[PDB]
Design an enzyme around this catalytic site. Sequence first.
Site, PDB file in Angstrom:
ATOM      1  N   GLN A 116       0.784  -1.231   0.000  1.00 37.44           N
ATOM      2  CA  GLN A 116       0.000   0.000   0.000  1.00 37.44           C
ATOM      3  C   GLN A 116       0.827   1.298   0.000  1.00 37.44           C
ATOM      4  O   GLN A 116       0.292   2.376  -0.268  1.00 37.44           O
ATOM      5  CB  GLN A 116      -0.937   0.021   1.210  1.00 37.44           C
ATOM      6  CG  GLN A 116      -0.289   0.122   2.578  1.00 37.44           C
ATOM      7  CD  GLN A 116      -1.302  -0.014   3.709  1.00 37.44           C
ATOM      8  OE1 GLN A 116      -1.660  -1.120   4.101  1.00 37.44           O
ATOM      9  NE2 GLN A 116      -1.774   1.106   4.224  1.00 37.44           N
ATOM     10  N   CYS A 126      -5.221   0.353   3.476  1.00 36.69           N
ATOM     11  CA  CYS A 126      -5.250  -1.049   3.924  1.00 36.69           C
ATOM     12  C   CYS A 126      -6.586  -1.734   3.654  1.00 36.69           C
ATOM     13  O   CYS A 126      -6.639  -2.881   3.211  1.00 36.69           O
ATOM     14  CB  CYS A 126      -4.924  -1.142   5.420  1.00 36.69           C
ATOM     15  SG  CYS A 126      -5.940  -0.164   6.530  1.00 36.69           S
ATOM     16  N   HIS A 147      -6.590  -1.531  11.463  1.00 36.15           N
ATOM     17  CA  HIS A 147      -5.895  -2.017  10.280  1.00 36.15           C
ATOM     18  C   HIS A 147      -6.659  -3.199   9.640  1.00 36.15           C
ATOM     19  O   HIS A 147      -7.037  -4.156  10.318  1.00 36.15           O
ATOM     20  CB  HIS A 147      -4.462  -2.415  10.651  1.00 36.15           C
ATOM     21  CG  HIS A 147      -3.587  -2.738   9.475  1.00 36.15           C
ATOM     22  ND1 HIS A 147      -3.419  -1.880   8.411  1.00 36.15           N
ATOM     23  CD2 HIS A 147      -2.808  -3.815   9.212  1.00 36.15           C
ATOM     24  CE1 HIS A 147      -2.600  -2.427   7.529  1.00 36.15           C
ATOM     25  NE2 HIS A 147      -2.204  -3.598   7.996  1.00 36.15           N
ATOM     26  N   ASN A 170      -0.753  -9.368   4.919  1.00 41.31           N
ATOM     27  CA  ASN A 170      -0.693  -7.927   5.098  1.00 41.31           C
ATOM     28  C   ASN A 170      -0.452  -7.253   3.719  1.00 41.31           C
ATOM     29  O   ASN A 170      -0.292  -7.933   2.690  1.00 41.31           O
ATOM     30  CB  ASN A 170       0.393  -7.584   6.136  1.00 41.31           C
ATOM     31  CG  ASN A 170       0.221  -6.208   6.798  1.00 41.31           C
ATOM     32  OD1 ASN A 170      -0.708  -5.453   6.494  1.00 41.31           O
ATOM     33  ND2 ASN A 170       1.141  -5.884   7.727  1.00 41.31           N
TER      34      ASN A 170
END
Length: 219
Positions: A19, A25, A163, A186
């Site tokens: 990102q 996110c 997140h 992630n």
Amino acid sequence: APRSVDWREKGYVTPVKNQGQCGSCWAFSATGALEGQMFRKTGRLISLSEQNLVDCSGPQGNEGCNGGLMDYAFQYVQDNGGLDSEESYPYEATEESCKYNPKYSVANDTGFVDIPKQEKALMKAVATVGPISVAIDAGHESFLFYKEGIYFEPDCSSEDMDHGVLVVGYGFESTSDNNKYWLVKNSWGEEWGMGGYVKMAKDRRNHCGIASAASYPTV
Ligand SMILES: *C(=N)C1(NC(=O)[C@@H]2C[C@@H](S(O)(O)c3ccc(OC)cc3Cl)CN2C(=O)C2(c3ccc(Cl)cn3)CNC2)CC1
């Protein structure tokens, strides 16, 4: 449910993305979940445009590089009637004017499901659905500097998440006393954690709120 699940093995999961310095996110979490559901539907794994979500999902409540919700992203895709591919609408890591082009739409959704707020329910969803969008408390330096093993942070909140990430499976280490984890993708690139992944503590009182705001799109 099986003792371990890893949807990467079954072709549901694209490579780890990054990102950058944009607060997107939520967009990566949402494309992750939709990539998986589209793969289940069609047998084709196609990387989807986070930029399309960042630039265009304001009406649904998203705030570009300043944050958003995976469910608002899923609502956008439904309202809009589609979502462009990564290739057609590449990631810029800054909010720009909406450039959605329906000619290059490769994904759709018909709504979303919010999973009950328990790890048992999350486990059943991961086992039966595919990758799941989740909210976690990532607001500790231990997370930022995570490298390997099962992430446990005593100060993690089960209620206060900040997140958006993607659960792609779960399992256990064969090593000792606390050995179960969620396998989490992630969006901070491959050099963070274990190739961009983190093994998060599982069945330890909803650690970091991983089961508190879990959802996926219907296709
Ligand atoms: C990501 N780079 C970053 N974080 C967010 O945008 C983050 C994503 C979601 S979650 O996953 O944190 C989340 C928290 C709570 C709940 O329900 C109680 C659900 C979810 Cl999915 C929301 N994020 C936020 O930062 C907040 C937010 C929500 C909505 C909008 Cl339009 C903007 N910000 C701030 N409080 C939730 C760092 C930017």
